[PDB]
Design an enzyme around this catalytic site. Structure first.
Site, short mmCIF file in Angstrom:
data_model
loop_
_atom_site.label_atom_id
_atom_site.label_comp_id
_atom_site.label_asym_id
_atom_site.label_seq_id
_atom_site.Cartn_x
_atom_site.Cartn_y
_atom_site.Cartn_z
N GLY A 102 44.81 -7.62 -65.04
CA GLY A 102 44.66 -6.22 -64.71
C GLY A 102 43.70 -5.44 -65.59
N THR A 103 43.91 -5.48 -66.91
CA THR A 103 43.06 -4.70 -67.81
C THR A 103 41.63 -5.22 -67.80
OG1 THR A 103 44.92 -4.10 -69.25
CG2 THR A 103 42.70 -3.98 -70.18
N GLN A 142 43.80 -9.06 -72.81
CA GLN A 142 44.48 -10.03 -73.67
C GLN A 142 43.64 -11.29 -73.84
OE1 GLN A 142 48.92 -10.52 -74.04
NE2 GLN A 142 48.48 -12.17 -72.58
N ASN A 188 40.67 -21.78 -66.59
CA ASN A 188 41.53 -22.46 -67.55
C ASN A 188 41.65 -23.95 -67.28
OD1 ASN A 188 43.31 -19.46 -67.43
ND2 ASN A 188 42.43 -20.27 -69.33
N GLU A 220 15.67 -13.62 -72.68
CA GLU A 220 14.82 -14.77 -72.38
C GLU A 220 15.45 -15.67 -71.33
OE1 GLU A 220 11.91 -16.59 -74.01
OE2 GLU A 220 11.14 -14.56 -74.31
N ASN A 239 40.46 -21.23 -76.30
CA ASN A 239 39.69 -20.17 -76.93
C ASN A 239 38.76 -20.73 -77.99
OD1 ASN A 239 41.03 -18.30 -75.30
ND2 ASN A 239 42.61 -17.93 -76.84
N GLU A 264 47.27 -2.34 -74.17
CA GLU A 264 48.61 -2.53 -74.71
C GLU A 264 48.52 -3.01 -76.15
OE1 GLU A 264 50.29 -5.47 -75.55
OE2 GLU A 264 48.61 -6.84 -75.18
N1 LIG Z 1 40.77 -18.76 -71.92
C1 LIG Z 1 41.83 -17.99 -72.11
N2 LIG Z 1 42.34 -17.25 -71.06
C2 LIG Z 1 43.43 -16.46 -71.24
C3 LIG Z 1 44.03 -16.38 -72.49
N3 LIG Z 1 45.08 -15.54 -72.38
C4 LIG Z 1 45.14 -15.07 -71.12
N4 LIG Z 1 44.13 -15.64 -70.40
C5 LIG Z 1 43.81 -15.40 -68.98
O1 LIG Z 1 44.20 -14.09 -68.61
C6 LIG Z 1 44.76 -14.09 -67.31
C7 LIG Z 1 45.83 -13.01 -67.20
O2 LIG Z 1 45.37 -11.76 -67.65
P1 LIG Z 1 45.82 -11.20 -69.09
O3 LIG Z 1 45.93 -12.32 -70.09
O4 LIG Z 1 47.13 -10.46 -68.96
O5 LIG Z 1 44.65 -10.17 -69.51
P2 LIG Z 1 44.65 -8.65 -68.97
O6 LIG Z 1 44.83 -8.64 -67.48
O7 LIG Z 1 43.38 -7.95 -69.36
O8 LIG Z 1 45.94 -7.95 -69.64
P3 LIG Z 1 46.95 -7.12 -68.71
O9 LIG Z 1 46.18 -6.07 -67.95
O10 LIG Z 1 48.00 -6.45 -69.56
O11 LIG Z 1 47.61 -8.04 -67.72
C8 LIG Z 1 45.33 -15.47 -67.11
O12 LIG Z 1 45.10 -15.91 -65.79
C9 LIG Z 1 44.59 -16.36 -68.08
O13 LIG Z 1 43.70 -17.20 -67.39
C10 LIG Z 1 43.53 -17.13 -73.54
O14 LIG Z 1 44.07 -17.07 -74.65
N5 LIG Z 1 42.43 -17.93 -73.35
MG LIG Z 2 47.81 -7.78 -71.17
#
Ligand SMILES: Nc1nc2c(ncn2[C@@H]2O[C@H](COP(=O)(O)OP(=O)(O)OP(=O)(O)O)[C@@H](O)[C@H]2O)c(=O)[nH]1
Ligand SMILES: [Mg+2]
Ligand SMILES: Nc1nc2c(ncn2[C@@H]2O[C@H](COP(=O)(O)OP(=O)(O)OP(=O)(O)O)[C@@H](O)[C@H]2O)c(=O)[nH]1
Ligand SMILES: Nc1nc2c(ncn2[C@@H]2O[C@H](COP(=O)(O)OP(=O)(O)OP(=O)(O)O)[C@@H](O)[C@H]2O)c(=O)[nH]1
Ligand SMILES: Nc1nc2c(ncn2[C@@H]2O[C@H](COP(=O)(O)OP(=O)(O)O)[C@@H](O)[C@H]2O)c(=O)[nH]1
Ligand SMILES: [Mg+2]
Ligand SMILES: [Mg+2]
EC number: 3.6.5.-
Lengths: 432, 37, 64, 429, 42, 37, 439, 432
Positions: free
Chosen positions: H137-138, H11, H199, H247, H221, H64
């Site tokens: 997680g992902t 995500q 963050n 480089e 972002n 997802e």
């Molecule tokens: N910089 C930034 N970080 C994000 C953003 N959205 C989520 N995160 C980071 O993503 C972390 C949580 O993981 P997820 O957003 O669920 O990404 P993911 O783990 O690959 O997705 P899931 O496996 O479904 O949980 C949080 O601790 C955030 O720091 C965003 O829009 N910008």
């Molecule tokens: Mg997710």
């Protein structure tokens, strides 16, 4: 080059500096937007930008947000930088302890950050000019803290304090003598020139010499800004005799402990009496030297002059300046001290003073401001320390100071160094 | 319950030719009035 | 009188000159030697930067 | 910055309702809470006394206390009753019955948890609160007991913040109950040890002002509450509006308190004019100064001529000129040197605010730490001694958990408070 | 007690000494004259 | 600075807001364009 | 060579010594068992711990310390603590009943049955040490044991060892924060010994440490553990010159002659800086000038005695770390230029400085933080007359109509001893006044 | 020429990729429909298709469907390919085991198919920029699996992983230390350069330097996309010093296990403050080296810098670049390790940053982005594995991982891998 950084501490400092900055913008032809509609002379007070916009080299800093926020909402919102415009959340509450040990410690860090950014933006920094009132809390505590930090960071770089001391009778606060006697530490140790701008002298001057029924702090600050513009015009604009800050610093300060200096400015005249008087250089010099035009409430006759510096602006001639000097020397009521024969500094500028629209000063082709160190200034310290002793004889208002991280001995050491001030003033004024 | 009127009100401000205008003039600040362009 | 080392003023500016502190080490411990070596090297960097900025400001003011 | 207010008892509730009427009138807030002002200055610092909601309505930072539920209903029936937050009304089922013990140990204690919760909520909502404000009458039961108990708890929870109290001291001329000495003696010893500035109201002086200053045939509690609400709004006007020489409540406290025990202040307002002579009087700084120090203008019944002024503060409101304001108290200091203490050189703190109360070109509120408050405290103590010497009206207090020793201790602390002012009145350099 | 340290403070203020003697200045000037006479063949 | 006052200066070079690698030798703005009249 | 014998008396002395030894062992790289496992930065077989530790055939380093308390709680806590293997089974004398805030009990009734064994242990240590510089006593005059048994022990050592150096580090009563009601009695009665049989007596009151911890360390709830940590820091800072190499090496007799101008004038003032925590360690530019200014400032002083209220007579600094002689001399010159710290007229020099290249060692779990440089004051000044002016006023106010005197009298103590103590304390006031008076 | 592939996993990766692509289209003047209104300058990010429009070289891979469906229904629906926009059916459920051992395997095959299509569409591929969040997680599990497959398949191509590490204080997840620890196990082996984008560092930077009360994931972002654009501008446009991914990766990685590097960007100012400050190269470099202007809360004073790579954009010149370098060396509070005397890599590009309409950044004539390897990085790993130990002492949240086809010993193995990572950080930080 030759830039100077302005600092405005407290409500009084912020308002005085804001009048100074409207005067500077008007003199340099800078609109409140911060641009020239239609020459590197403004550089010492305004920093250029790639878009052709001018930003003042100033830092407003008050522990309470009313004055700074109202300036932000004022006319010069586009002129003043969003930063270097620091506002606190709770003021020093007219307390040196609160301003120097409780609330100033959480703001002096970012104050020094802003000052460092201004210095880095600068190229030829001549010095700092600090506007504050030693009788308040923020102007006392935060002022002392910032002066300490600047002394330990920038070293021997010049720091001139255009400070508003308590006046003998026209005083606002009650713990104001405490604030003054405790700011004496910083204004004695970590500054090189201290110019007194007490309000009673301003009031009496605008009464007996400027003729408006009800002027106020606005007129006071406008006249103070005129004075500071007169001081800085020597480096701002070309002239027969140009002096920077350090040029007159040594010419005005004979000893490290002797740097509290009286001031005066003339002609302070209205439009009605401006066009019927031939304001000659000798006339304006005599008016400045007379106590009628003296800008701080202190009688020169009770002491002896040690060193004067004169700032002439306009069509003043190098003949006229030293002819006035010769007449002053022939005059007996203006007595210089025995060990300083010359006692005179002169700086002539070709730029006539500029009058703010809607103000009280009248357009004059020439003017002069005298910044003079004299032995007579022992009286202001004598009266302020007498008031301090009267209030401190049985510990009035001392619980407020000692409940905010201050010791009992701080008042004692303030009395000690103020004492050393009147003693060494007397001893240097004593005849050989 | 009845409360008297005009105790805490000056006639020159409340009643006259331009009460709203004089109120607006009052409700400005000293910096605003003294410092204009 | 003779107070220059406390006043901090010598001819040539407050900054000194480069030298081999490895030779000046004589029975001093590692902490003191490291402090001295860092001080000397960092002093030299300050001196170079001060000269560079002085020359740059000279050039700028001439350009004006 | 922000100030949260507390109203205790029926007296405190009516006075606070009038005060909020005055504040909303000044800030252009409708009874529904909508903003109808036409200036930026009114809205700039509305957060000091008000909190905005999601819908834009401005709700006062106020809490209400009364063991009788009828006072809350009266506040609802008031013209600005809809302005307050409904959950800030904490009320009991049985009234204090003009019993300090009932309002401080039995009924106040069992109800003070809710009011402390609400004040904590308001304090957390405030970004950086300047202090706490309270309006109460020390002669009642709820305004004295619950008021003092809340002052104590807020002092414990917020030691750095500043406490302001408006205590309606009773007088024998306006002694409308029988246990004024008991309640006042039992409450003054919390006021001294828990309030940073505690300024006094006497209905006798309020009626005197309504008689020979206002020249109104029949004022009411509404007019008295308006007279106290005007100065209550003026003492905090510097926080809300700019000024040539801005100040705040901590500056007022530090300038008005030379010693910790001396924090009981004068209270006055100007210009107070009769409905007839109002158009003819030229409102000037000289007139304001002449009315401030006049004995008849004081809203507590004690002669300021008898005592000496330890210090005083003048909250001048309106676009003024500064040497006039400074000189109108310099010359008072000079011509009334026998009425001011000698060891303090400047006994006057002048504060200037740009915005005067709407409907006036000029105004001033006067707050003075005079030494004749010992007369009022002495009279209260004499009445208390007369009642307490013979167990009069004492079983009501003792049966509610209080001890016979606490009355003696309260009288003793009254004696300390009186003796401090006594021995600073005649002090010589 | 406040009178006690008021008296002590008054004594310390009386004993307070300024930074400039004008007598140390005179002694230094005598030394200066001695040095000038040592120099200045004429 | 000319005898006729402050006036636009004439230089020779490519003006590019988009500092693309390929268009170093291609005019892409009306600034470099002249038309006979 | 240059050995020193630590003698801790009373509960306060025992805990101060515990802190001092837990600092010393980590500073010298000695484990709580009493052995140095392996050191590569520090050369092997280095005779630096010889002053404070005596070697044993099993590589053990037995501390040159004696613990002496009339009651067994603190000494048994030490025996069951983490330094049981380190400390000698002997040298750790235990009593059966404390003096109980009674100078008479500690000096006449219960002290006599243990002073013999105390001197036995002291003579054993003296025989072991072939270059004994002197004895550093650690105690507090507030307690009955530390007063009486301390006075007896110092008297016996003075009469037995002649002119051996004696550093009596004593926790005097503070102006307001005090824990004993007969503490003025104990303090005024202990001044006989602390004035006659002590070479340098060091002010170590409690509330000054309390304020220093509450301000400099920014810690709200510290205790005797933190107080002892700071006092051990000061002790190690002032005594490590004879253990580690430095530009200026100083011994106990080397600096006591500088500190003490007159035989009766030997009570001394302490401060230590930079005293900072982990958060504030990097928040300041801690240079030699800055640390010296903080040392000379009354805020950093370790005892309630304003330097501005008196005349500085003698003063020496103990610098540790990367300090340099030019830096200390520049600090001295800045101090002379400063006028709030003004010396007595008859002593122009007034200054001594010692430099050690060993920076202070921070104990884990302590509130101190590592500093590249540090410095400890020790100065004899006329301002110390005020702590005596407070304690003797307190003693007279308590003795106006013979309070608590029966407890002392019933333990074989003469009534006139209180009057004699008052008289020589008055003399200790008068000679301070005379020496501070302008010539 | 010089093509490069972006892979957005998770995500956070998808959101960051959305920001990066909305920045890139405006950078290259490409409309959201894919067609702009002799230009071989977009090749590294877009490819010209069989329709005359341009399709990005990106793969939005996620387990997802919410974020990918938002992309497919958003304003850029016609820009991205219907493929290379991979959509799952059930997320990793914030579980590294679930995303790496159960659902990751049934999607990594088609992810690699899309990567193959992108690669053989490209002709001068340099490397893969991977955007994910190890905290979740992902992005942890599927990211680890996909990076392993790319490492074993494509050889020694550049691997620039700009991932969002857990922040010291607030973390979205509660098994987030577990996910971070178990993902660093793979990222230590199959990532040439790893960059942290936690963050709270971005939150503090945007609060104190952009003066916006409540920026959000959109704003962070946008900042991350600006950082990525600045890093890729060296190859996108020509300049004084053009440096490629290969480089600078070797310049920034001193040892094979030392590749996790901090990042920082400046100037980050709003429109209000843009016109008041003269953003000089020295000023922006000082802001970068300051701990407030950096996107990771690894306070550099806690360690020693090993290698700092600087990307200047706009009208920056090499001489004030190296003047900033020299004054940074001259700055007291920061020090370099004793075996990196050079320690600095510099690259200058002539293209200034391009702001997004309705965005949060004001137009600046120059900018600078830093990627720095420093020994202070060990502190965040120490906090992360301390939290890991705190959770793993009670075996909390371990049943979820062991029920998704994950051995219990892998937790311990990752734990001692992190321990060895902190130990050899300390070793390389120790002076010789
Ligand atoms: N910089 C930034 N970080 C994000 C953003 N959205 C989520 N995160 C980071 O993503 C972390 C949580 O993981 P997820 O957003 O669920 O990404 P993911 O783990 O690959 O997705 P899931 O496996 O479904 O949980 C949080 O601790 C955030 O720091 C965003 O829009 N910008
Ligand atoms: Mg997710
Ligand atoms: N010259 C001049 N003095 C002013 C002005 N405003 C206030 N003062 C001085 O400020 C003094 C009162 O101090 P304060 O009201 O506490 O203001 P302050 O000095 O800034 O201190 P703080 O309010 O705590 O910030 C008065 O005696 C005035 O002399 C002004 O506009 N011009
Ligand atoms: N600096 C410091 N002072 C302490 C310490 N422990 C106790 N004190 C103080 O020193 C005073 C006297 O100490 P002691 O001589 O041991 O008195 P005691 O603790 O009652 O034990 P006895 O002397 O046997 O009566 C006590 O009143 C404490 O306030 C300590 O560990 N460090
Ligand atoms: N100013 C003013 N005073 C009031 C008002 N109502 C009551 N009082 C005064 O309050 C005192 C009695 O207070 P009381 O009602 O018993 O307080 P409570 O028991 O806490 O509700 C009397 O001396 C009255 O003079 C009012 O509306 N305005
Ligand atoms: Mg103010
Ligand atoms: Mg004991």
């Amino acid at each position: 080059m030759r830039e100077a950084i302005c600092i405005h501490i407290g409500q009084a400092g912020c308002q005085v500096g804001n009048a100074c900055w409207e005067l500077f913008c008007l003199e340099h032809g800078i609109q409140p937007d911060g641009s020239m509609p239609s020459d590197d002379a403004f550089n010492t007070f305004f920093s250029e930008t790639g878009a052709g916009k001018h930003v003042p080299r100033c830092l407003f800093l008050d522990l309470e947000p009313t004055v700074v926020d109202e300036v932000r909402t004022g006319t010069y919102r586009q002129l003043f930088n969003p930063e270097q415009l620091v506002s606190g959340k709770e003021d020093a509450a007219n307390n040196y302890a609160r301003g120097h040990y409780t609330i100033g410690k959480e703001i002096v860090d970012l104050a020094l950050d802003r000052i460092r950014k201004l210095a880095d933006n600068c190229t030829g920094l001549q010095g700092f000019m600090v506007f504050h009132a030693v009788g308040g809390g923020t102007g006392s505590g935060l002022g002392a803290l910032l002066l300490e930090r600047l002394s330990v960071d920038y070293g021997k770089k010049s720091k001139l304090g255009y400070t508003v001391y308590p006046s003998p009778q026209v005083s606002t606060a009650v713990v104001e003598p405490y604030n003054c006697v405790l700011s004496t530490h910083s204004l004695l140790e970590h500054t090189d020139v201290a110019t007194m701008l007490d309000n009673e002298a301003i009031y009496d001057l605008t009464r007996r010499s400027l003729d408006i029924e009800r002027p106020s702090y606005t007129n006071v600050n406008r006249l103070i800004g005129q004075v500071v513009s007169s001081l800085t015009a020597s480096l701002r604009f070309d002239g027969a005799l140009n002096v920077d800050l350090t040029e007159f610093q040594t010419n005005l300060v004979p000893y490290p402990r002797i740097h509290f200096v009286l001031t005066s400015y003339a002609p302070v005249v209205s439009a009605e009496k401006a066009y019927h008087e031939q304001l000659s250089v000798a006339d304006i010099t005599n008016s400045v030297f007379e106590p009628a035009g003296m800008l701080t409430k202190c009688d020169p006759r009770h002491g002896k002059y040690m060193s004067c510096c004169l700032m002439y602006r306009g069509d003043v001639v190098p003949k006229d300046v030293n002819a006035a000097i010769a007449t002053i020397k022939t005059k007996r009521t203006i007595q210089f001290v025995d060990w300083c024969p010359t006692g005179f500094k002169c700086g002539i500028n070709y730029q006539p003073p500029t009058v703010v629209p809607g103000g009280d000063l009248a357009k004059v082709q020439r003017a002069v401001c005298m910044i003079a160190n004299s032995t007579a200034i022992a009286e202001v310290f004598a009266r302020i320390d007498h008031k301090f002793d009267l209030m401190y004889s049985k510990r009035a208002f001392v619980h407020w100071y000692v409940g905010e991280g201050m010791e009992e001995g701080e008042f004692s050491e303030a009395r000690e160094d103020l004492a050393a001030l009147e003693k060494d003033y007397e001893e240097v004024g004593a005849e050989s | 319950t009845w409360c008297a009127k005009g105790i805490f009100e000056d006639p020159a401000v409340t009643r006259g030719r331009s009460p709203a205008q004089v109120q607006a003039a009052l409700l400005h600040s000293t910096y605003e009035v003294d410092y204009t362009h | 009188s003779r107070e220059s080392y406390i006043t901090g003023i010598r001819p040539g500016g407050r900054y000194g000159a480069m030298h081999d502190v490895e030779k000046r080490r004589d029975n001093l411990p590692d902490n003191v030697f490291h402090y001295m070596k860092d001080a000397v090297q960092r002093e030299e960097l300050l001196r170079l930067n001060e000269e560079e900025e002085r020359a740059r400001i000279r050039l700028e003011m001439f350009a004006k | 910055r922000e100030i949260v207010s507390c109203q205790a008892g029926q007296c405190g509730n009516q006075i606070g309702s009038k005060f909020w009427e005055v504040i909303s009138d000044e800030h252009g807030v409708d009874p529904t809470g909508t903003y109808q002002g036409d200036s930026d200055l009114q809205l700039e610092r509305i957060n000091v006394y008000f909190d905005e909601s999601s819908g834009g309505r401005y709700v006062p930072r106020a809490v209400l206390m009364d063991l009788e539920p009828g006072t809350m209903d009266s506040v609802r029936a008031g013209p600005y009753g809809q302005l307050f937050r409904p959950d800030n009304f904490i009320f009991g089922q049985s009234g204090a019955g003009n019993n300090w013990a009932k309002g401080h140990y039995t009924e106040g204690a069992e109800l003070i948890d809710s009011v402390l919760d609400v004040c904590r909520k308001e304090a957390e909502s405030c970004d950086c609160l300047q202090g706490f404000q309270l309006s109460h009458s020390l002669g009642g039961g709820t305004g004295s007991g619950m008021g003092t108990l809340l002052i104590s708890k807020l002092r414990e929870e917020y030691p750095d913040r500043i406490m302001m109290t408006f205590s309606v001291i009773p007088s024998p001329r306006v002694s409308d109950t029988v246990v004024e000495p008991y309640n006042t003696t039992l409450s003054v010893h919390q006021l001294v040890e828990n309030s940073d500035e505690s300024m006094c109201i006497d209905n006798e002086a309020l009626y005197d002002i309504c008689f020979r200053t206002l020249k109104l045939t029949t004022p009411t509690f509404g007019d008295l509450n308006h007279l106290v609400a005007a100065v209550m709004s003026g003492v905090t006007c510097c926080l809300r509006f700019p000024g040539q020489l801005n100040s705040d409540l901590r500056k007022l406290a530090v300038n008005l308190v030379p010693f910790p025990r001396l924090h009981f202040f004068m209270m006055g307002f100007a210009p107070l004019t009769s409905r007839g002579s109002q158009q003819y009087r030229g409102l000037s700084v000289a007139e304001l100064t002449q009315q401030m120090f006049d004995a008849k203008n004081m809203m507590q019944a004690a002669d300021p001529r008898h005592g000496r002024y330890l210090t005083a503060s003048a909250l001048f409101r309106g676009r003024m000129s500064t040497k006039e304001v400074d000189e109108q108290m310099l010359n008072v200091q000079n011509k009334n040197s026998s009425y001011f203490i000698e060891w303090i050189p400047n006994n006057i703190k002048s504060s200037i605010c740009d915005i005067p109360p709407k409907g006036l070109k000029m105004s001033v509120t006067f707050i003075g730490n005079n030494t004749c408050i010992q007369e009022m405290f002495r009279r209260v103590g004499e009445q208390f001694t007369g009642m307490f010497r013979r167990k009069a009206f004492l079983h009501w207090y003792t049966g509610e958990g209080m001890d016979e020793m606490e009355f003696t201790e309260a009288e003793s602390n009254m004696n300390d408070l009186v003796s401090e002012y006594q021995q600073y009145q005649d002090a010589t350099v | 007690t406040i009178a006690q340290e008021n008296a002590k403070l008054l004594e310390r203020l009386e004993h307070a000494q300024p930074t400039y003697r004008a007598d140390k200045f005179e002694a230094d000037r005598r030394r200066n004259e001695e040095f000038a006479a040592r120099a200045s063949r004429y | 600075a000319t005898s006729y006052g402050m006036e636009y200066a004439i230089t020779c070079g490519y003006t590019t807001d988009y500092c693309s690698r390929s268009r170093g030798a291609v005019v892409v703005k009306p600034e470099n364009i002249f038309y006979f009249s």
